[PDB]
């Protein structure tokens with residue numbers, strides 16, 4: 001007897017019609033749908049409870065269900081005439097109006113691309129070249145290297161390739177933003193380069209974790225080169241890319257171009273099943289926090305504080321303090337650079353999830369989330385500019401200062 005419940009009754013009876021053999025089954029399902037549509041018509045949308053009954057938005061709201069009942073009656077006519085297949089075809093027209101509802105009222109849409117800043121496209125390209133240069137230096141340095149590479153370098157290389165490949169998609173999103181969320185590259189490049197981003201970004205976050213584990217292993221076990229298993233890197237590297245691949249599978253199944261009518265543009269969005277669009281957006285958002293921040297941060301944090309106590313356990317010399325503090329400074333940078341770059345995006349992601357769940361119905365809050373999302377998304381890309389400084393460039397100084405305190 002609620003708007004959310006009235007739409008579940010409708011989309012559930014839509015399925016009954018699609019799998020039916022006689023017109024009596026269709027007639028029965030359509031009868032329930034007509035009652036739900038009329039009842040839903042008497043349900044103010046929760047996100048705009050403030051708006052008065054006669055506001056033009058509540059006029060278009062109740063009107064959407066008049067179009068719906070009109071289609072439900074046209075199908076009932078065919079079903080009463082024993083035209084089961086004709087009625088089923090008419091029910092396809094209902095999914096078209098149901099799609100119009102979830103865009104207009106369900107989610108962020110009820111509160112436009114006309115919040116466009118010229119800065120974002122400028123900033124996105126700035127990070128692109130800056131990141132592509134520092135990361136093309138990381139890989140090229142390996143050519144000029146003069147020493148024995150530890151398994152750590154394997155993670156440095158894979159971290160840079162992922163950073164380069166995800167940074168390589170920044171021009172797509174800068175142009176996508178400059179054209180007010182109107183995808184021009186085609187429907188295949190939205191599903192492809194949309195998942196390709198999520199793929200390399202999970203890989204980037206998963207390899208950052210491998211680095212924090214390896215460095216924690218380096219402090220607790222000084223003889224780690226011999227202590228290692230030669231095959232471990234041969235197993236860990238494939239495993240990371242596969243975990244990143246599995247983590248981005250939802251993007252590949254759903255990421256596709258869909259036409260936003262009221263905006264008149266072709267957007268590259270997550271095309272969830274409309275009958276469960278809110279539940280997926282909330283669920284997928286929460287898996288972004290867990291797999292992409294919570295679980296990762298549990299490793300970096302544990303590895304850091306595990307390094308911190310070990311260094312505090314060895315000695316207390318006044319000079320060795322300098323060598324041990326520089327290691328703590330370098331271990332404290334990866335953990336801080338990760339939360340500074342990623343905590344903004346994931347907080348907004350969690351809040352957006354609380355919106356799809358119905359907790360945050362404030363439009364002023366949802367507007368702030370939408371206005372701050374492109375900047376938070378940029379800090380995520382920025383950690384790809386900070387990774388070269390955190391590992392590669394300070395990689396020679398890390399190994400040396402452990403061999404000093406382990407003399």
Ligand SMILES: COc1ccc2c(c1OCc1ccccc1)C[C@@H](C(=O)O)N(C(=O)C(c1ccccc1)c1ccccc1)C2
Nearest residue numbers: 173176177194197198201202268288292345374377380381
């Ligand atoms: C056609 O668009 C887009 C398709 C797919 C994606 C995005 C996108 O939006 C991009 C966009 C930017 C600017 C303007 C318009 C769009 C952005 C982002 C997201 O969930 O929302 N995303 C990501 O994998 C995340 C992410 C989060 C957790 C763990 C791994 C990856 C991401 C966040 C921040 C920085 C990089 C990656 C895929």
Ligand SMILES: CCCCCCCC/C=C\CCCCCCCC(=O)OC[C@H](O)CO
Nearest residue numbers: 297301302305306308309335339340343344
């Ligand atoms: C933008 C800045 C806002 C800051 C918000 C950060 C959000 C992440 C929260 C915690 C991650 C770190 C976990 C901290 C847990 C402390 C563990 C600890 O203190 O361990 C002591 C050690 O064991 C001695 O014996």
Ligand SMILES: CCCCCCCC/C=C\CCCCCCCC(=O)OC[C@H](O)CO
Nearest residue numbers: 278279280282283286287290291356357358
């Ligand atoms: C290896 C371990 C990996 C762990 C894997 C992480 C996956 C995410 C886990 C839990 C989130 C569950 C979210 C599902 C619930 C979605 C919200 C919902 O259904 O409710 C919507 C709302 O009620 C309508 O108004």
Ligand SMILES: CCCCCCCC/C=C\CCCCCCCC(=O)O
Nearest residue numbers: 286289290293294343346347350357
């Ligand atoms: C970045 C900050 C992250 C905050 C931690 C939140 C972690 C959430 C983890 C699992 C979500 C649990 C289930 C989600 C709510 C149940 C669905 C519902 O209530 O309808």
